[PDB]
């Protein structure tokens, strides 16, 4: 992540990120709502960072340093550029809503009152169609990616040295190749939990409660479509094993 | 230090997310309790052996039968959770969770964990459960369920007070290290 955003989301909560004199001006219910919105944006910033480790550190590093057979890097990192485009765009919209809400003279004091409409836009129309198509493809290639990674790490010396080299720093502790893949797969199922908790503290404005209710339904529809569209691909599995599913 | 993977499973109200948060911070959050848990790698030394224990939550995956099993590959130990304030969460252990974990994680040790043990003697909890003809799970009911499902062991803890939390993860590490 870039330093400006890391610092804006360094605190454990919105209530610790804003100036204490600004915090004191809000009702308890507003603080509760803002703390959960801040967790949604903070976790989305970290998710985009996970995708940047996959595209830039791993994928591009393997293309520039290793001599892997064609189709191997794509097999290890299926759909990573499409996933990066989807979430970098969503993160950009969340961060622009925060930036517009800042008080003049401050780079940390804000309240986001209208998140619902942004979530309806993200989880409907062409952007929801692209999220559904991309996660149905990625999650169906999850077992195949893990198996290809394990085979290469166990049999290719230069590949094992590369992985050990780039994952040695302490900041990569939670972000090995397989760990990145499961962080990405699990991201989509975090959204309902976060949206439901924001909705719990958004009754103050009826239009906002209605918009978050619509967004939660759209996210659950997307998850149900992705879940029904998954079938694990397996290298070497014969047609007979597939049509006898 | 060898790397091992832990996954926690159980119903949405079992307290699995809170348990991972409290263990990973060695603290129940004083300002904000997070809604979600991403992952974590804990450095644990148990009985003289150093392990890096990767921790994962299945919260949010309960309704998605094709997405949820993607969390299971290469798991070394399962924490199978229920809440002591919810006999309904204990009833779902042999019905759904046990056959699923046995299928996707064959021969992986399962530790059955009774969460929220601080609510066993909470008056509000006892009054609320009595309306549905229920009562908090007794320790012998937890041990019997663990015995029946072939669990490696039975343990209890409270994420609120931290009691028993360290012990659960140290035992999970010992289970992960066994042949
Ligand atoms: C007190 C023992 O601490 C550990 C326990 C398990 C794994 C690693 C460590 N340390 C030693 C190496 N570097 C990371 C921390
Ligand atoms: C999601 C948990 O489902 C199970 C639970 C117990 C045994 C088998 C299954 N599978 C067997 C093949 N895949 C679909 C269901």
């Amino acid at each position: 992540s870039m330093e400006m955003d890391e610092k804006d989301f360094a605190a454990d909560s919105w209530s610790l990120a804003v100036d204490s004199s600004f915090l004191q001006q809000h009702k308890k219910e507003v603080m509760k709502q803002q703390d959960v919105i801040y967790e949604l944006i903070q976790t989305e910033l970290h998710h985009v960072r996970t995708l940047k480790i996959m595209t830039r550190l791993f994928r591009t590093g393997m293309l520039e340093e290793l001599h892997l057979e064609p189709g191997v890097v794509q097999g290890l990192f299926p759909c990573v550029d499409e996933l990066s485009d989807i979430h970098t765009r969503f993160l950009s919209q969340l961060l622009e809503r925060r930036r517009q809400a800042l008080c003049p003279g401050s780079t940390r004091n804000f309240v986001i009152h209208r998140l619902g409409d942004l979530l309806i836009s993200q989880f409907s129309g062409p952007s929801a169609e692209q999220m559904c198509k991309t996660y149905s493809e990625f999650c169906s290639r999850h077992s195949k990616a893990l198996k290809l990674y394990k085979e290469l790490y166990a049999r290719d010396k230069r590949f094992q040295q590369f992985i050990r080299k780039v994952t040695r720093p302490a900041v990569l502790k939670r972000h090995g190749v397989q760990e990145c893949i499961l962080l990405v797969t699990q991201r989509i199922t975090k959204y309902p939990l976060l949206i439901s908790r924001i909705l719990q503290h958004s009754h103050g404005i009826e239009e906002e409660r209605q918009d978050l209710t619509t967004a939660l339904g759209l996210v659950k529809e997307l998850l149900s479509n992705v879940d029904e569209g998954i079938y694990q691909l397996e290298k070497g599995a014969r047609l007979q094993e597939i049509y006898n599913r | 230090a060898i790397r091992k993977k832990l996954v926690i499973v159980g119903d949405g109200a079992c307290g699995k997310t809170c348990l991972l948060i409290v263990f990973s911070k060695d603290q129940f959050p004083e300002v904000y309790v997070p809604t979600v848990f991403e992952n974590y790698v804990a450095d644990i030394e148990v009985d003289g052996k150093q392990v890096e224990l990767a921790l994962w939550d299945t919260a949010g995956q309960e309704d998605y039968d094709r997405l949820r099993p993607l969390s299971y590959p290469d798991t070394d130990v399962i924490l199978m959770c229920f809440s002591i304030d919810s006999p309904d969460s204990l009833e779902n252990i042999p019905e759904k969770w046990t056959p699923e974990v046995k299928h996707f994680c064959p021969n992986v040790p399962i530790i059955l964990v009774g969460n929220k043990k601080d609510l066993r003697n909470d008056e509000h909890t006892r009054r609320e459960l009595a309306k549905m003809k229920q009562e908090p799970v007794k320790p012998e009911e937890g041990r019997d369920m663990a015995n029946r499902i072939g669990a490696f062991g039975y343990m209890e803890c409270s994420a609120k007070t931290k009691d028993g939390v360290r012990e659960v993860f140290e035992m999970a590490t010992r289970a992960a290290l066994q042949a």
Side-chain angles (χ1 to χ4, degrees), chain B residues 3-65:
Chain B
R3 180 73 70 96
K4 297 290 183 177
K5 173 176 170 176
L6 176 150
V7 175
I8 190 164
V9 305
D11 289 353
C14 76
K16 54 194 172 175
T17 305
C18 280
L19 180 58
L20 289 170
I21 290 169
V22 173
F23 175 67
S24 62
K25 299 171 171 306
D26 190 20
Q27 172 72 46
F28 185 85
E30 305 159 298
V31 171
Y32 178 73
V33 181
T35 317
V36 305
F37 175 84
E38 297 153 303
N39 73 347
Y40 191 82
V41 180
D43 297 313
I44 294 173
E45 189 161 9
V46 63
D47 299 319
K49 300 189 203 154
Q50 288 174 329
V51 172
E52 290 196 358
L53 188 62
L55 312 177
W56 298 91
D57 195 358
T58 53
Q61 304 187 307
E62 300 88 349
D63 294 345
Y64 305 108
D65 299 335

Side-chain angles (χ1 to χ4, degrees), chain A residues 39 46 173 186 190 197 227, chain B residues 32-33 35 37 43 66:
Chain A
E39 183 184 5
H46 299 163
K173 194 187 193 185
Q186 288 198 344
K190 299 304 189 186
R197 191 183 180 190
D227 181 73
Chain B
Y32 178 73
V33 181
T35 317
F37 175 84
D43 297 313
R66 268 68 59 148

Side-chain angles (χ1 to χ4, degrees), chain B residues 93-135:
Chain B
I93 296 298
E95 182 183 357
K96 298 178 181 184
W97 298 114
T98 295
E100 172 172 311
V101 164
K102 290 186 170 179
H103 174 81
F104 291 107
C105 309
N107 304 312
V108 171
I110 296 162
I111 298 180
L112 183 69
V113 178
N115 275 344
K116 311 192 193 180
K117 80 183 166 102
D118 53 283
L119 302 179
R120 179 170 278 136
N121 292 306
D122 185 60
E123 294 304 315
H124 177 251
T125 295
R126 292 190 167 262
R127 288 196 304 271
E128 291 309 290
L129 287 168
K131 300 195 256 224
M132 308 297 302
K133 304 192 182 180
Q134 299 189 329
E135 56 196 300

Side-chain angles (χ1 to χ4, degrees), chain B residues 59-75:
Chain B
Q61 304 187 307
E62 300 88 349
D63 294 345
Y64 305 108
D65 299 335
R66 268 68 59 148
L67 282 168
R68 191 173 59 263
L70 296 179
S71 299
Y72 297 139
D74 308 300
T75 296

